[PDB]
Amino acid sequence: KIEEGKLVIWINGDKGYNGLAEVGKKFEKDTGIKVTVEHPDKLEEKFPQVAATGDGPDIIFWAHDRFGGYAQSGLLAEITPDKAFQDKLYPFTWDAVRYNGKLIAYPIAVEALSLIYNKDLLPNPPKTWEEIPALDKELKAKGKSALMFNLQEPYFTWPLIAADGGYAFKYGDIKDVGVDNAGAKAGLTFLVDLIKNKHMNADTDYSIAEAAFNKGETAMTINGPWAWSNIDTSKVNYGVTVLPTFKGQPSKPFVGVLSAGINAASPNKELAKEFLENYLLTDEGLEAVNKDKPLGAVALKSYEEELAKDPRIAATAENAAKGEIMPNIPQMSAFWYAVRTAVINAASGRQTVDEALKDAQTRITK
Ligand SMILES: OC[C@H]1O[C@H](O[C@H]2[C@H](O)[C@@H](O)[C@@H](O)O[C@@H]2CO)[C@H](O)[C@@H](O)[C@@H]1O
Ligand SMILES: [Zn+2]
């Protein structure tokens, strides 16, 4: 079971878990309460597994879309922030972590994907998806490829799929699923054509794409704020801008609010509330993590009005506006699992675009 008199936190491997472990150090120095940060694999799936038996971390971090499912399963404790405290964050951030009338988590940062490009290789990144193939051809003269990004996680391909009309649950309505409509078919087909014509490889994942771009072999990649620090290290002269358009329509990334929830079975809920409100959700707490791995547009009114002036952050916000905040309903997990399978199947050749999205639609509704 969950150890008392201590705090165990789970945050994803691509986040600043050191910047966090640091915030924990202060907490410990100030309370004698040790704080352990971990980033297990598939934690979004492992958490509900162990929390269901009363185990798991005291605090779990993840985009808000997975929390509705957790709250539904009674795995999250209700959080008690002062009306004053919840006045420090934007009303839209709180709505993200609100399920059936209850606030089930603490909003941390707003995440949206952006087009990241190499300024030296491409002083002027493309505005449309359509011109990328030609650009890839011309970049051969420099021994480079045009674009590389994670094709294994639907989160990354969804912006293109939803550009021409694809959608999950229309503004949260589970009876309205659009993963297999015309827009979705157009988007995915473009991606598969890019692969068939050798402009991209279906096997490209997060690691390969990040190395390819950071090692300066590819002129562009698609990723969130957490990827910037590593690029900074690479010394690549990069820029962050708006995602390309498809069929004239802007890419629509699914926007996620990194959030921290408290395990319903935790005997340390008091220590967790303290840590999160007075040690993390401050202007300095977020900074400590932001410096490790950028968070993006934070939920904290005070800090976001500070940032947002950052070019990269402003671009993040721009893309977020053209996209959509993610549902938080329990059904989101089935949606992702279905689209994940469909994108990999269509991209690998296992299935045609039509068959892939059809099956995805079925996995979701039937
Ligand atoms: O790909 C499906 C996946 O998308 C989102 O996960 C994001 C996460 O929100 C980001 O913070 C970052 O870590 O990249 C992840 C993609 O690998 C959804 O939040 C998640 O539920 C979904 O399974
Ligand atoms: Zn071509």
Tell me: do 243 and 271 sit in the same domain: no
Tell me: do 98 and 166 sit in the same domain: no
Strands 177-178 and 7-10: unpaired
Strands 254-262 and 59-63: antiparallel
* Resolution as reported, in Å: 2.1
Contact (CB, 8 A) for 205 and 149: no
Q: Which atom of ligand 1 is nearest to the CA of 66?
A: 21
What is the distance between the alpha carbons of residues 322 and 317, in angstroms, rounded to a whole number?
A: 9
How many residues are there in the chain? 366
With the CA atoms of 332, 280, 15 and 341 taken in that order, what torsion angle do they form, in degrees rounded to the nearest 10?
0
Q: Domain range spanning residue 29?
A: 5-111+256-327
| Pocket lining: 155 vs ligand 1, CB cutoff 6 Å | yes
Contact (CB, 8 A) for 183 and 162: yes
Amino acid of residue 330 = P
| Pocket lining: 154 vs ligand 1, CB cutoff 6 Å | yes
Tell me: do 14 and 66 sit in the same domain: yes
236: domain CATH number?
3.40.190.10
Max Cα-Cα span within the chain: 61
Helix (H), strand (E), coil (C) string for the chain: CCCCCCEEEECCCCCCHHHHHHHHHHHHHHHCCCEEEECCCCHHHHHHHHHCCCCCCCEEEEEHHHHHHHHHCCCECCCCCCCCHHHCECHHHHHHCEECCEECCEEEEEECCEEEEECCCCCCCCCECCCHHHHHHHHHHHCCEEECCCCCCHHHHHHHHCCCCCEEEHHHCCCCEECCCHHHHHHHHHHHHHHHCCCCCCCCCHHHHHHHHHCCCEEEEEECHHHHHHHHHHCCCEEEECCCEECCEECCCEEEEEEEEEECCCCCHHHHHHHHHHHHCCHHHHHHHHCCCCCCEECEHHHHCCCCCCHHHHHHHHHHHHCEECCCCCCHHHHHHHHHHHHHHHHHCCCCHHHHHHHHHHHHHC
Task: Work out how many domains the chain is built from and give that number.
Answer: 2
Amino acid of residue 110 = V
Tell me: do 267 and 201 sit in the same domain: no
Tell me: do 230 and 363 sit in the same domain: yes
| Pocket lining: 14 vs ligand 1, CB cutoff 6 Å | yes
Tell me: do 25 and 152 sit in the same domain: no
Experimental technique: X-ray
What is the distance between the alpha carbons of residues 47 and 57, in angstroms, rounded to a whole number?
A: 8
Tell me: do 337 and 316 sit in the same domain: no
Which of 66, 97, 153 for mutating ligand 1's site (highest number of atoms within 8 Å of CB)?
153
Amino acid of residue 333 = S
